[PDB]
Design an enzyme around this catalytic site. Structure first.
Site, short mmCIF file in Angstrom:
data_model
loop_
_atom_site.label_atom_id
_atom_site.label_comp_id
_atom_site.label_asym_id
_atom_site.label_seq_id
_atom_site.Cartn_x
_atom_site.Cartn_y
_atom_site.Cartn_z
N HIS B 47 0.86 -1.19 0.00
CA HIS B 47 0.00 0.00 0.00
C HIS B 47 0.90 1.24 0.00
CE1 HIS B 47 -2.81 3.11 1.38
NE2 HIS B 47 -3.80 2.31 1.04
N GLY B 56 -5.47 4.62 5.57
CA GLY B 56 -6.31 5.28 6.55
C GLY B 56 -6.92 4.32 7.55
N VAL B 57 -7.30 3.12 7.10
CA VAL B 57 -7.93 2.18 8.03
C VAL B 57 -6.98 1.80 9.15
CG1 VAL B 57 -9.57 1.28 6.33
CG2 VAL B 57 -7.34 0.13 6.63
N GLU B 61 -7.33 1.97 13.23
CA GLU B 61 -6.94 0.94 14.19
C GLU B 61 -6.00 1.49 15.26
OE1 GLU B 61 -8.15 -1.99 14.77
OE2 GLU B 61 -6.63 -2.99 16.00
#
Lengths: 132, 132, 132, 132, 132, 132
Positions: B47, B56-57, B61
């Site tokens: 990524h 972003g995810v 987290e």
């Protein structure tokens, strides 16, 4: 759309590519993708050591990658997400990712995503993207 | 709170532990955590291959793991997230994670999270948790 | 010099690229690089299981990679290293790598390296390179 | 001393344990260890993509781990290293690590290490340790 | 044939390339390959946690990859294997892979493989391939 | 039998545990296991870079691990395998592993295994085990 084609559509790659195949596609409308959940995926060792459960944030990423496939067959970055994590997902589950377009413009897209195991809903989200 | 203590507070472990240290802590109120962003983290290879950018995810987290530290020093699962991804995060960035409690009850907690690089806001979220 | 440029200058890649950015550069003279130390880097799982501490030899490699960046902006292999490991480095630390050229010739280069966290010196080395 | 015993003597573990077996041992004097170099080791993917060569710093770590085995059968941290990287090491090589004690005291140890492939010397080092 | 050449002959790559070098080659007849067994290979962490032993199926894959090298210097998929796992293989072992061609045709090949440590036979197989 | 129970029955662990759940079990007779095939499994990066296909030898290992579950609910090492690789298996496939006991004694067991995707047979094997 098999994995080999998915790999070329989605810019993400291992260990951050969370689509296996496309199951259903209505361009400019809807996509349905499949992600097999395998106990041999690297993130399970860390989430959690005592109990392997799929991180909800990676379901969000899977929904976002399904959306990107839908966009491209009609650089996208997640701009926002409004997500409810309803039910847990485990190794052995076949995760179904359903994306419906809400609105697309030259510079942004807004979608509604539903993640399912069988036809039990495990995650629902509204996602927005920008055209970075 | 150094990494060794963070490791024991947070049930997540490599490759899914995204806190390095706690910088500031007001119990039942607020926590500020630090996550160093390193180009040698495994998710960057995927990524993206051409351009390493923090997903972003995974900022979400990180914000959730900071919240869990705040809860425990006062099994938590992310129940919902309403998040805006404002600005990108890169290898070399020091990611600051600020969590403010909105409401806690015996069975749930709702927080507001802000992620910063320097004091530029890169991510804002409202998160809710259940006590699974 | 950001990570994307560092990646192209340095031939090493994940999991053996230990520079995140260049902070200061005086060609043919001096470079200052930054390496974020993250608990999510793969080597920490093995060094050590009970206690994550950055291996001194990887600080040496970081100093060598900073030197290679300095050389290239003015195939290098470490030919020798004389190193003192003064203080330990932990997840959460920002490792500063300062390289001063001692002597360069068509076939070799000799440098002095200092690694710092804040402005506490954690490692000092003299390094030599050949032009393999 | 086979790998299973080496694993318990050496606190390092995968991906940072670089001894396979002990070949020769004279307590308080000398040890000879073996490390098989395999193209299937994770660091080779990063050093280098175009050409797999063992990083010299990891030969130093192998020499240090051999020394630690010698110490324990008679928490050690590398305190200093003075090393000459003579010849390169490749997948398929059997790396021989020979450690001779120079001086040991309650709080420190100084050794001379030689790394060989066959009986060609590839690395020579003087190492010192502290008893952290 | 060194590792760099093996890498280009064999389509498999890390973490599924199990040849280090070619030791002996009689085209259209026989090949002898070497695979160093290293405790730093990723599969050992899973097979087994308490006791690192090379999985027999990966010896089969090594024998198949040696055969593919023999074929190419004279897309091959394993079509069948009849294998006896005689003796275990451990970190520190040098695995010798000997392949003798039984019969080759335009569309298939049948070989006999022997895996050895020293000159103790650890695995014997008959393998067949198709030209996919 | 879910993944958490499978993990405790099978001594193999990540990255060498290739069962997700048990679907059907007749003790001393038959077992049917499921392994989800995910493009996010580490071996696919190496087999093959251009085209992800499940290695046949890992289907054999999956069949062997299913057999071990059957044995334990009624240290097993694969002693022999006679296997035909009929059809390829891809990310997105749900691999069904069917094991029928042929003969068990105090010191050995012989089984017939069939691997299926849907109800197309992809692999058939006869396996034998010893009680190491």
């Amino acid at each position: 759309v098999n994995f080999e084609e998915v790999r070329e559509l989605v810019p993400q790659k291992y260990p951050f590519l969370f689509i296996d195949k496309v199951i259903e596609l209505q361009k400019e409308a809807r996509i349905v993708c499949l992600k097999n959940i395998s106990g041999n995926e690297p993130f399970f060792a860390g989430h959690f050591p005592d109990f392997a459960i799929m991180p909800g944030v990676l379901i969000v990423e899977a929904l976002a990658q399904a959306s990107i496939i839908l966009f491209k067959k009609s650089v996208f970055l997640l701009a926002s997400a409004n997500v409810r994590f309803s039910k847990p997902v485990f190794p052995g589950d076949q995760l179904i990712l359903e994306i419906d377009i809400e609105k697309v413009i030259s510079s942004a897209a807004i979608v509604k995503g539903v993640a399912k195991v069988g036809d039990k809903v495990v995650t629902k989200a509204t996602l927005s993207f920008g055209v970075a």
